[PDB]
Design a protein around this ligand. Structure first.
Ligand SMILES: Nc1ncnc2c1ncn2[C@@H]1O[C@H](COP(=O)(O)OP(=O)(O)OP(=O)(O)O)[C@@H](O)[C@H]1O
Ligand SMILES: Nc1ncnc2c1ncn2[C@@H]1O[C@H](COP(=O)(O)OP(=O)(O)OP(=O)(O)O)[C@@H](O)[C@H]1O
Ligand SMILES: [Mg+2]
Ligand SMILES: [Mg+2]
Lengths: 187, 419, 209, 419
């Protein structure tokens, strides 16, 4: 059920990010409407600036969390696809990769890692062969629908917002401001 | 029925219960007055009522029972305590008393207690046979109180740098030297959060003197442990009262095999308050201070020790420097050799502003070998050698940016010794 | 205050202004201060913002010290420990309410007026206020105004109440204004602000320069 | 029933008393209070009770007998001695006395002294014709007081290095120039163990003047001889009176042809206490120190001397330097020329963390020819030649590592001679 947990975690993270983006858009619309109006509303304008900056910080945080969840679910899908494909054809892969790895158990740790690197470059060339001929490929049959739902890469509207970052002091001051603003909305 | 939950809960539902119960006028009076009103209404209606709090003794057995959530403020909500039960139970000041209470009678306007059912979270006869705190032989800080949150939060860097700079142990006397506007308040509140997270078993206490009410309430809301904060509104007499209450309650609690941690800010203001409140003896030192007017702060700070048989009393305090008053750095100088650990927040990094702003080279603690494991000793020793030569500012940036990608202390140590 | 300053007070401000002159004794000052702070508390209890400009803490403390009976305990300058309880309560009544309304107190204080207990009040009132604004006599002597000591003056917890872009603009401003003395910094600031129109414009022409 | 065995025993005795006759309340009150109560209830039966302690006289012969184990608290457990008893028994301040005690009747609270059976561990009237210490002509340090335990302990190499650096005689006055964080406190404990092991005949009397509770309360469980100290909780009057008590006791003991060794840590804080307790004479030097404020500790420090009639009075006291207070250096330069034995502690060695961190080049004993024999003299002389050229750190660590494989100092001498 780990795959389903990753799936619905990504789903709710995406929903939260979309809600944050909608709130930021509404706040920006209100700010521009107030700026267009002749009314001064100096404190109102200042708190609008505060709310839009904290909303865009929250949007950045939500986009980062969604990207992290996307990476996590992709890693889990890759891992268990390798695992079951592996339980199917471990002997088939070992027959090809053998002449460097019969004595893995009796080899010491450093020799183990040396054989690790030899297999790293062996598989480097093995995948380079596919990527040189390069025909079109699709997802695994068992979990094609899920991988299509999450997709090949996250949306650009999340990575572009996640491009900029903040120092930890900025992170916690914005966290305090967000908590205070949420409390004020609650009251 | 317990009035502690009545005082803990906000006033809105208290008012609503006031109208729903049939109280004529509950609009305009104090919180303690409201509590007294509902308690009197319960007494008249005849419902069974219980009481609890912390007991204090006057000069003639005129015992009182206050509450921690009320900051030990005197008022009608306090419980009267006659000398009869004091002498028949051998109880003293600062005993956590809980039991039955009696409504006040004619000519007396304070609620009394009928029969105590527990004292200091223990049976009264079992708690009768206890040894005084001053009769317990102190020992070294055998147990290490690690400050590592462990979750790698965005604020855990302060806890990690505090752990590397100076470990915290049971029954340890602490000095925090820092000029004003150096982030002391958040350092203490982060210490409180780390203590509550890592060690929920230990009783966490915080003490504040003449702090702004907004700071008082943010301290109350942020930390789960109870806090006693006497604001600048009241005179120094209430500061003395609350400080004695806190220290002596901690003494009683550690007498009951419970290790106690208390946070104070700042010791200089407390010393000034004691100097002002006490009458002068005719001899005055520089800065308007007296030895008889200032030995009691020394007794307060020196009460911290580790009990040889069980429990401990650990005091962490902050000192103010460069405040423009001579007595401030005078009492700072007299406190050079009164605590077994010390930590500085040098101001040069404070206008450099890169946080946390602590003088790692100047900060230190004695008796490391008996406090934590050996490999940790060699690791911090290597850190001290690699951090000693260059200045404090660039050392601070070095330390923080090699504490950025590292997750835990072990990660930092392994990345240090692999390069 | 003298009556002419009072008259200047009414005919300039828009909201109502309360002013007790020196002609009446200190008891009138005490009663008017207590009832005006009570009125402010009642108004802020109903979720409205009340801002009080106070002039001055020194005179109010004078009145409270000279109105209360002597308790037998006197500090330096003849002041009483319990006499200073009331003015400190008046100053500390300020707070911010999340439920509704707020109470802001902007009070002025007197320094080095040739007395002794005035500096006692100053030193006792240093840590009780979270915002401070200093004035200097040397800058006023050169007749360049306002003579505020920017370096020593400031505020705390200012990052949680306003947008942060002007936070970094003023942070680099504090970088570029800390080293030199307060006076020449003040002439620099006034000559920079004179040729601008708004604070933001001055901000970006500092940023580009 | 003597009070020393019931004083030195821990709180366990309390509960036994609770079952010897059934005190109605003994659990919760101070050690002085419990001792007074149990002694009173034992005396009310009419049984004879012993008593003993050190006597001091007030400004009106209002004599107090304190106990050395409790570090001379001014509590009601102290024994009253009237001026008539003082004049009849012919005794002075600092006399260790014993005898029958008199339970107090109404109007008085302090216990009296009926009879006497031993004065200064001697027959009472035999001490009447005792020569005054001040009238005894001083002599140099004749006998050698070696610090060699001979067991080859791991920490014994520190004592061996001290012996190679500067030997202490009998009645020898010593100065330790130890800045903070130099390992002076446990160096003092180590030399105390060496004194107690090599020379059990001479009495050991170590005092701490201004010392934090931790290491002073573990002092009792480490050293064999009795320790006297007063923490920082109490004001300077306690420190002054306990220093007077210890100096009078040492003088009285050495007056009876006995060897007394006094270990002081530290002269700096004791001098500061005298400065803060002494009235101002109008002539103050730099750093806030008075001329009489400097003279007052000199009387205590100048008692180190040797007596030809028998016995000796050795004083080994440490001093604090580089503590951040300039008057500390003032008193250092004031006390520099009064000591005939001196050894320094270096900081840079302490950061090098190789120990003992003593400055061999800047340490020596004045006129060591009479104290030591001529051949060991020559060997030490050779050591000074092999050590003087190079620096302190490398030479001292060379001496340490060439002491590693050897067990005793002499074997180390013949191993250098063949090297
Ligand atoms: N780690 C940090 N993260 C964010 N801000 C920090 C940090 N350390 C210090 N600061 C900033 O430094 C200042 C310290 O504020 P704080 O209220 O803690 O000061 P203080 O030294 O306790 O003094 P005072 O009681 O007068 O407020 C604030 O402006 C705060 O934002
Ligand atoms: N011979 C030694 N062997 C091992 N460690 C030593 C030795 N001498 C000093 N040290 C180290 O130096 C530290 C010095 O601590 P200590 O409390 O003894 O110092 P001190 O000179 O008495 O000064 P203060 O207690 O005022 O800081 C010891 O805790 C220990 O870590
Ligand atoms: Mg603070
Ligand atoms: Mg020491």
């Amino acid at each position: 059920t780990a795959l389903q947990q990753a799936f619905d975690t990504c789903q709710n993270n995406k929903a939260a990010w979309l809600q944050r983006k909608n709130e930021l858009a509404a706040a920006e619309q209100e700010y521009l409407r107030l700026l267009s109006g002749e009314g001064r509303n100096v404190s109102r304008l200042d708190e609008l600036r505060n709310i839009i900056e904290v909303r865009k910080w929250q949007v950045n945080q939500a986009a980062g969390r969604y990207i992290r969840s996307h990476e996590a679910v992709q890693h889990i899908s890759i891992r268990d696809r390798l695992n079951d494909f592996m339980q199917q054809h471990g002997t088939a892969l070992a027959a090809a990769l053998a002449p460097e790895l019969m004595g893995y158990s009796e080899l010491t740790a450093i020799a183990r890692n040396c054989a690790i690197q030899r297999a790293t470059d062996a598989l480097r060339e093995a995948l380079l062969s596919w990527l040189a001929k390069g025909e079109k490929i699709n997802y695994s049959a068992q979990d094609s629908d899920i991988l299509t739902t999450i997709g090949f890469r996250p949306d650009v509207a999340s990575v572009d917002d996640s491009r900029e970052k903040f120092t930890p002091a900025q992170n916690m001051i914005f966290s305090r401001k967000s908590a205070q603003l949420a409390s004020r909305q609650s009251v | 029925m317990n009035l502690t939950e009545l005082k803990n809960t906000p006033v809105s539902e208290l008012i609503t219960l006031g109208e729903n119960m049939g109280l004529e006028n509950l609009a305009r009076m104090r919180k303690q007055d409201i509590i007294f009103a509902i308690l009197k209404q319960h007494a008249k209606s005849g419902e069974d009522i219980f009481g609890d709090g912390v007991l204090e003794i006057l000069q003639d057995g005129f015992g009182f029972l206050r509450s921690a959530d009320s900051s030990y403020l005197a008022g009608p909500d306090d419980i009267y305590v006659s000398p009869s039960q004091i002498r028949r139970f051998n109880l003293r000041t600062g005993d956590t008393i809980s039991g039955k209470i009696r409504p006040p009678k004619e000519g007396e306007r304070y609620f009394a207690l009928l029969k105590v059912n527990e004292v200091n979270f223990d049976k009264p006869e079992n708690a009768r046979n206890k040894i005084l705190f001053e009769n317990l032989t102190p020992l070294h800080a055998n147990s290490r109180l690690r400050m590592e949150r462990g979750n790698g939060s965005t604020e855990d860097l302060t806890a990690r740098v505090l752990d590397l700079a100076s470990p915290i142990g049971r029954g340890q006397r602490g000095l925090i030297v820092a000029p004003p506007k150096a982030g002391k308040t958040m350092l203490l509140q982060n210490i409180a959060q780390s203590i509550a997270y890592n060690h929920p078993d230990c009783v966490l206490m915080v003490l504040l003197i003449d702090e702004r009410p907004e700071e008082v309430t943010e301290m109350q809301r942020l930390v789960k442990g109870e806090v006693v904060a006497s604001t600048f509104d009241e005179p120094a007499s209430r500061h003395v009262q609350v400080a004695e209450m806190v220290i002596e309650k901690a003494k009683r609690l550690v007498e009951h095999k419970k290790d106690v941690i208390i946070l104070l800010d700042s010791i200089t203001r407390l010393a000034r308050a004691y100097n002002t409140v006490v009458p002068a003896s005719g001899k005055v030192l520089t800065g308007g201070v007296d030895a008889n007017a200032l030995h009691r702060p020394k007794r307060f700070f020196g009460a911290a020790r580790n009990v040889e048989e069980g429990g401990s009393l650990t005091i962490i305090a902050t000192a103010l420097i460069d405040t423009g008053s001579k007595m401030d750095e005078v009492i700072y100088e007299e406190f050079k050799g009164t605590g077994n650990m010390e930590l500085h927040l040098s101001r040069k990094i404070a206008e450099k502003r890169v946080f946390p702003a602590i003088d790692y080279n100047r900060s230190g603690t004695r008796k490391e070998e008996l406090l934590t494991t050996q490999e940790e000793l060699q690791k911090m020793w290597i850190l001290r050698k690699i951090i000693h030569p260059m200045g404090e500012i660039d050392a601070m940036e070095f330390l923080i940016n090699k504490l950025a990608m590292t997750k835990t202390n072990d990660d930092f140590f392994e990345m240090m010794k692999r390069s």
